[PDB]
């Protein structure tokens, strides 16, 4: 565990993280994909061997000794708000199980279902709150990665709010 488990937010490419493992915002088929998933494919392509896994689940594949946790959030274009919300919560619960099993002291994590899978909605609060529900009982340092300057400010405020 980390000595004083924390949350932090950084605005940069998650492929350049300084943590002990990475969460991929994966597709169910283990394809290179776009956005975070394509950056992850360019950096850790070996981790896409047998990475396909259903919506609402996470599957870890090692690139050398570096763990890539493939977490599949729902595409809100296809799911109802209700079912999508349930699957998005479940994907983060499976990330917390994997982070714990791996015994890492730190993890780099993107906000699942906030990009191409958002069904054109702002899901910062929805996705971040499910991230906190899952990760709060873990003792890894969590570093959230984002690309937008206004999202960085809002994620930083949400972290500081809880103190
Ligand atoms: Cl960058
Ligand atoms: Cl997405
Ligand atoms: Cl972002």
Describe the protein's architecture and organization.
The two termini are 20 Å apart. The protein has four helices and six strands. It has one domain. By secondary structure, the chain is of the alpha/beta class. The radius of gyration is 14 Å and the shape is globular. The longest helix is centred in the middle third of the chain and has 22 residues. 44% of the residues are buried. It has a three-stranded parallel sheet, with helices on one face. α2 packs parallel to α3. One chloride ion binds next to loops.
Essential attributes:
alpha/beta, 163 residues, globular, binds chloride ion
Portion of residues in beta strands equals 15-25%
Give the tally of β-strands: 6
Integer count of domains: 1
Could you give the distance between the termini? 20 Å
Strand order of the largest sheet: 1-6-5
Would you tell me the structural class of the helices and strands? alpha/beta
Helix content: 25-40%
What does the largest sheet look like?
3 strands, parallel
Number of helices: 4
Q: How many whole angstroms does the radius of gyration measure?
A: 14 Å
Bulk shape: globular
The ligands found in this model are:
chloride ion
| H-E string | EEHEEHEHEH
Domain Macro: 4-163
Protein name: Non-structural protein 3
Organism: Chikungunya virus (strain S27-African prototype)
Membrane topology: Peripheral membrane protein
State the gist of this model:
This protein is an alpha/beta fold and about 160 residues long.
Write the SSE topology.
Layout: E1 7-11, E2 22-25, H1 36-43, E3 58-63, E4 66-71, H2 81-102, E5 106-110, H3 124-135, E6 141-146, H4 149-162
Parallel strand pairs: 1-6, 2-4, 5-6
Antiparallel strand pairs: 3-4
Helix pairs in contact: 2-3
The structure holds chloride ion (3 copies).
């Amino acid at each position: 565990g980390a000595m004083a488990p924390s949350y932090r937010v950084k605005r940069m490419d998650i492929a350049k993280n300084d943590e002990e493992c990475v969460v991929n915002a994966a597709n169910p088929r283990g394809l290179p994909g776009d956005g975070v998933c394509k950056a992850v494919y360019k950096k850790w392509p070996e981790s896409f061997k047998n990475s396909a896994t259903p919506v609402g689940t996470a599957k870890t594949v090692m690139c050398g000794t570096y763990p890539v946790i493939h977490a599949v959030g729902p595409n809100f274009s296809n799911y109802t708000e209700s079912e999508g919300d349930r699957e998005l919560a479940a994907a983060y619960r499976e990330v917390a199980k994997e982070v714990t099993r791996l015994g890492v002291n730190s993890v780099a994590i993107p906000l699942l279902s906030t990009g191409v899978y958002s069904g054109g909605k702002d899901r910062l609060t929805q996705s971040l709150n499910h991230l906190f529900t899952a990760m709060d009982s873990t003792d890894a340092d969590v570093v959230i990665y984002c690309r937008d300057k206004e999202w960085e400010k809002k994620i930083s405020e949400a972290i500081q709010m809880r103190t």
